[PDB]
């Protein structure tokens, strides 16, 4: 289970020639979108910043501000996503999502639950540097209920480390979840927040299997039968992530492409934020769990230059 991405540092890189290339495309009458998507999808996020710095030092124009004006549509949303630095991306998505009573809970659920504690320690700091208040403070403001209490548990980024499997704790946690689920009629949601948010990944992977043999249900089936709403999605999101993170994002991409139409914001977020992390593992678990390739479903659910950059980001 080696994590590798689909986009690496382009060999033979020049900050200035690529800046001059992106200039002529946007300069003049109209655009040359194929010259932009080929450049951006074949350059790493670290290289994309050196081109942005050389673009401003050469012409005195903001490369990001010139892309929003020259482009539009779904192609505009994907291009600016690749431009945002990896250090700023996850905080940028949580920023624009956490806003208002119509807060998109899926973006909060997908990012906070599938990111390692070390990944979230950098997210909380970057959120406070670029923006005003704290990520945790802005979460509880536009959130409530047990769904809020689970979000801040994960935001603490203090999960137990992997350092051995405890048979005694595995059997008692599996019983405590059973003694808070099917047996305890109703639901004691606080017991699920403590176990699913604190214990180590290796410990919970063995609690999931020990819970199955003492109850008969998988840990995912008890969650849905007892919980509903955003709390049900948060519990299932951490469980699928603890089992395998690339397997969870592969599910988030699969269900974003079928329905009445394409969830373009979700497909852009996952394919970009993991393009240099574990996107190859995502498409590996994608051909395994759904009997089709990511390159195929993007081919038939997207159009124009917007699908060209998505397929180059996939890599055949
Ligand atoms: Ca132009
Ligand atoms: Ca019950
Ligand atoms: Ca569809």
UniProtKB/Swiss-Prot annotation:
Family: Belongs to the annexin family.
Subunit structure: Monomer. Binds ATRX and EIF5B. Interacts with hepatitis B virus (HBV).
UniProt organism field: Homo sapiens
UniProt repeat feature Annexin, residue ranges: 13-84, 85-156, 168-240, 244-315
Associated disease: Pregnancy loss, recurrent, 3: A common complication of pregnancy, resulting in spontaneous abortion before the fetus has reached viability. The term includes all miscarriages from the time of conception until 24 weeks of gestation. Recurrent pregnancy loss is defined as 3 or more consecutive spontaneous abortions.
Cross-link (Glycyl lysine isopeptide (Lys-Gly) (interchain with G-Cter in SUMO2)): 27
Pfam families (alphabetical): Annexin
GO biological-process terms attached to the record: blood coagulation; negative regulation of apoptotic process; negative regulation of coagulation; signal transduction
Phosphoserine: residues carrying this PTM: 35
Name of the molecule in the record: Annexin A5
Post-translational modification: S-nitrosylation is induced by interferon-gamma and oxidatively-modified low-densitity lipoprotein (LDL(ox)) possibly implicating the iNOS-S100A8/9 transnitrosylase complex.
InterPro entries from the UniProt entry: Annexin, Annexin_repeat, Annexin_repeat_CS, Annexin_sf, ANX5
Residues annotated with N6-succinyllysine modification: 288
């Amino acid at each position: 289970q080696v994590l590798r991405g689909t986009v690496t540092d382009f060999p033979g890189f020049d900050e200035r020639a690529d800046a001059e290339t992106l200039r002529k495309a946007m300069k003049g009458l109209g655009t040359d979108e194929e010259s932009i998507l080929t450049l951006l999808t074949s350059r790493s996020n670290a290289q994309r910043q050196e081109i942005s710095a050389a673009f401003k030092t050469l012409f005195g124009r903001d490369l990001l501000d010139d892309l929003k004006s020259e482009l539009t549509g779904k192609f505009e949303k994907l291009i600016v996503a690749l431009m945002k630095p990896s250090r700023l991306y996850d905080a940028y998505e949580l920023k624009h999502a956490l806003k208002g009573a119509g807060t998109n809970e899926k973006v909060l659920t997908e990012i906070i639950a599938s990111r390692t504690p070390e990944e979230l320690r950098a997210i909380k700091q970057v959120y406070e540097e670029e923006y005003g208040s704290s990520l945790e403070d802005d979460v509880v403001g536009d959130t409530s209920g047990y769904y809020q209490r689970m979000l801040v548990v994960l935001l603490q980024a203090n999960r137990d480390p992997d350092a051995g499997i405890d048979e005694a704790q595995v059997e008692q946690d599996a019983q405590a979840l059973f003694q808070a689920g099917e047996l305890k009629w109703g639901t004691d949601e606080e017991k699920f927040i403590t176990i699913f948010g604190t214990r180590s990944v290796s410990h919970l992977r063995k609690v999931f299997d020990k819970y199955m043999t003492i109850s008969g249900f998988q840990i995912e089936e008890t969650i849905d039968r007892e919980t509903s709403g955003n709390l049900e999605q948060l519990l299932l999101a951490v469980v699928k992530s603890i089992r395998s993170i690339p397997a969870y994002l592969a599910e988030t991409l699969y269900y974003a492409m079928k329905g009445a139409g394409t969830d373009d914001h979700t497909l852009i977020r996952v394919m970009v934020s993991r393009s240099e992390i574990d996107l190859f593992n995502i498409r590996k678990e994608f051909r395994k769990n759904f009997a089709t390739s990511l390159y195929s479903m993007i081919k038939g659910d997207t159009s124009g230059d917007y699908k060209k950059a998505l397929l180059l980001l996939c890599g055949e």
